[PDB]
Design a protein around this ligand. Structure first.
Ligand SMILES: O=P(O)(O)OC[C@H](O)CO
Length: 294
């Protein structure tokens, strides 16, 4: 049985590594019965298209992030700005009650089942000088850019390399995995560490397709998703260290916001939670659960 999975990231990036590991593990556990074909880097379209294709069952699985907030506002809270103190905090929440609260009701709305949660990494600024900034076209990001006084230029990730090459935008903010993967520092060499948001993605599965399988097969899929997520949680920290080094080796600079700007981002981050209180019925409970794991 072939499972087609689409994603949005290049090879060597944690989402994509995750996808392959899931594939490797699932073949293992199911004894060669299931094979997974991985289509990363928007090969089967960008997020809106491949999410829709997965909802329809045209493909069985997809890897993405808070893009699915379009279908279920609470999903945005997977990337609540300023919510987690570090990766370990976020992992406790994401393997615990916080994820459960966020995911309640999602499948009913979407036709998708969220199988795991794993990080791509904290977002840091990249720019030509230490401003037309790229932002993802997702509400939580356009809102947050505003609160930061940033002039946001919404565009899908797939368009980022051309946008950089084209030379009108001055920067953006991304996980280090993405900054290094796209060699952003060659064009926008100045990175400022902020970590205002931790990017969290998931492997999603067409729910109809999933529930059509034997309870045993469902278990192997679930175990493969868990193992794969566990691997990614364990590799991002080490990778960000090497990424930071790499930037500093290759004419890149790393900066430290100033007290004054750090404060400006935190407040911006806290203000941006109105978006969730406005849009997510159980926002306070979700926030409370995350705080319980601190
Ligand atoms: O990946 P980006 O840079 O488009 O940011 C959007 C995140 O993937 C949302 O989870």
């Amino acid at each position: 049985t072939v499972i087609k999975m689409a994603g949005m990231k290049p090879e060597g990036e944690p989402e994509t590594i995750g996808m392959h590991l899931f594939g490797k593990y699932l073949k293992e556990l199911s004894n060669g019965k299931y094979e997974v074909q991985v289509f990363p880097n928007s090969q089967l379209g960008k997020e809106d298209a491949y999410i829709a294709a997965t909802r329809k069952g045209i493909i069985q699985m997809c890897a993405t992030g808070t893009q699915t907030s379009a279908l279920h506002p609470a999903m945005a809270m997977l990337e609540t700005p300023m919510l987690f103190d570090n990766l370990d905090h976020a992992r406790r929440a994401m393997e615990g009650k916080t994820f459960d609260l966020i995911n309640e009701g999602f499948t009913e709305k979407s036709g998708l089942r969220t199988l795991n949660a794993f990080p791509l990494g904290f977002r840091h600024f990249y720019s030509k000088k230490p401003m037309r900034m790229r932002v993802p076209n997702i509400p939580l990001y356009t809102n947050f850019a505003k609160e930061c006084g940033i002039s946001g230029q919404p565009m899908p990730f797939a368009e980022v390399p051309g946008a950089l090459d084209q030379g009108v935008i001055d920067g953006g903010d991304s996980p280090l995995a993405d900054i290094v993967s796209l060699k952003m520092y060659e064009i926008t060499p100045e990175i400022s560490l902020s970590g205002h948001i931790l990017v969290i993605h998931s492997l999603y599965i067409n729910d109809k397709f999933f529930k059509s399988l034997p309870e045993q097969d469902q278990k192997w899929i679930e175990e493969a998703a868990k193992r794969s997520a566990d691997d990614v949680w364990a590799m991002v920290a080490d990778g960000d260290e090497k990424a930071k080094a790499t930037i500093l080796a290759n004419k890149g600079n790393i900066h430290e916001p100033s007290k004054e700007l750090h404060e400006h981002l935190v407040n911006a981050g806290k203000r941006s939670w109105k978006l969730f209180y406005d849009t997510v019925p159980n926002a306070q409970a979700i926030l409370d659960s995350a705080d319980s794991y601190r």
